[PDB]
């Protein structure tokens, strides 16, 4: 039927990459899909919000870097920044 | 022959422990379903709700009331009490801005 975009399998591979002996129910899967989408809307909304104030038309990696610093607090922020910085350097290389 | 006669408070704490580690829905389904339809019929008649639509409403209302009860209970010990009052809820909503 109609293909609905979801992060059902993507969370599953993340779970097995850090915990290859546990599973996850569909109700917990839907919570994770809602959790990913809400954080996606918050950061992309913030990144769009940041670009409008600087009169900038594009959203770069620095837009996301500032967005996750504003939303995620403290130690959770800098690991996400470090993980984000590592991903961009690996992608460019 | 003597009855057990549990003193008040111990079984209430037992109910607290048995219901904090559990995840079943405390409010019954149709009584919450019928309350939604009566409230919605004041805004618009001939309105229907999906089964999962009320499911979203029921869990959100319970968690909001549980969190309100947590602030309501926290006000009781702050007021040197263990019994919650209707004025405790009114203070809780006012501080939250509701």
């Amino acid at each position: 039927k109609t293909r609905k975009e979801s992060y059902a399998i993507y969370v599953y591979k993340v779970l097995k990459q850090v915990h290859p002996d546990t599973g996850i129910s569909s109700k917990a899967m839907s919570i994770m899909n809602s959790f990913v989408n809400d954080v996606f809307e918050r950061i992309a909304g913030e990144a769009s919000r940041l670009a409008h104030y600087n009169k900038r038309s594009t959203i770069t990696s620095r837009e996301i870097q500032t967005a996750v610093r504003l939303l995620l607090p403290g130690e959770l922020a800098k690991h996400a920044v470090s993980e984000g910085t590592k991903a961009v350097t690996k992608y460019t290389s | 022959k003597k009855p057990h006669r549990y003193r008040p408070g111990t079984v209430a704490l037992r109910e607290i422990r048995r219901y904090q580690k559990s995840t079943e829905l405390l409010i019954r389904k149709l009584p919450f379903q019928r309350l939604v339809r009566e409230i919605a019929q004041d805004f618009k008649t001939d309105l229907r709700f999906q089964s999962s639509a009320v499911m979203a409403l029921q869990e959100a209302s319970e968690a909001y009331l549980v969190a309100l009860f947590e602030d309501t209970n926290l006000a009781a010990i702050h007021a040197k009490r263990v019994t919650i009052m209707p004025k405790d809820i009114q203070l809780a909503r006012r501080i939250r801005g509701e």
Binding site: - | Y19, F32, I39, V82
Partner: protein
């Protein structure tokens, strides 16, 4: 549909407070909790009514309830 505010029974309000760690529950709490729940339901459902009216739909879906809860800082996961 009348007298449906009493559907939230006193043990149901008692059970809700037990989840919140409430030691003792007064007799006037149940009437106040019903009124608070009625006010909270009157805001979420009305917001969901406008969401359903905007979509040219006659049945309120779970997604519209999520958006009604999300706009007031009470976002819900799992639906």
């Amino acid at each position: 549909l009348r007298d449906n505010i009493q559907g939230i029974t006193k043990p149901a309000i008692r059970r809700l407070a037990r989840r919140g760690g409430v030691k003792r529950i007064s007799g006037l709490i149940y009437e106040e909790t019903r009124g608070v729940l009625k006010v909270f339901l009157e805001n979420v459902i009305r917001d969901a009514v406008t969401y359903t009216e905007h979509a040219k739909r006659k049945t309120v879906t779970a997604m519209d309830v999520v958006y009604a809860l999300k706009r007031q800082g009470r976002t819900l996961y799992g639906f």
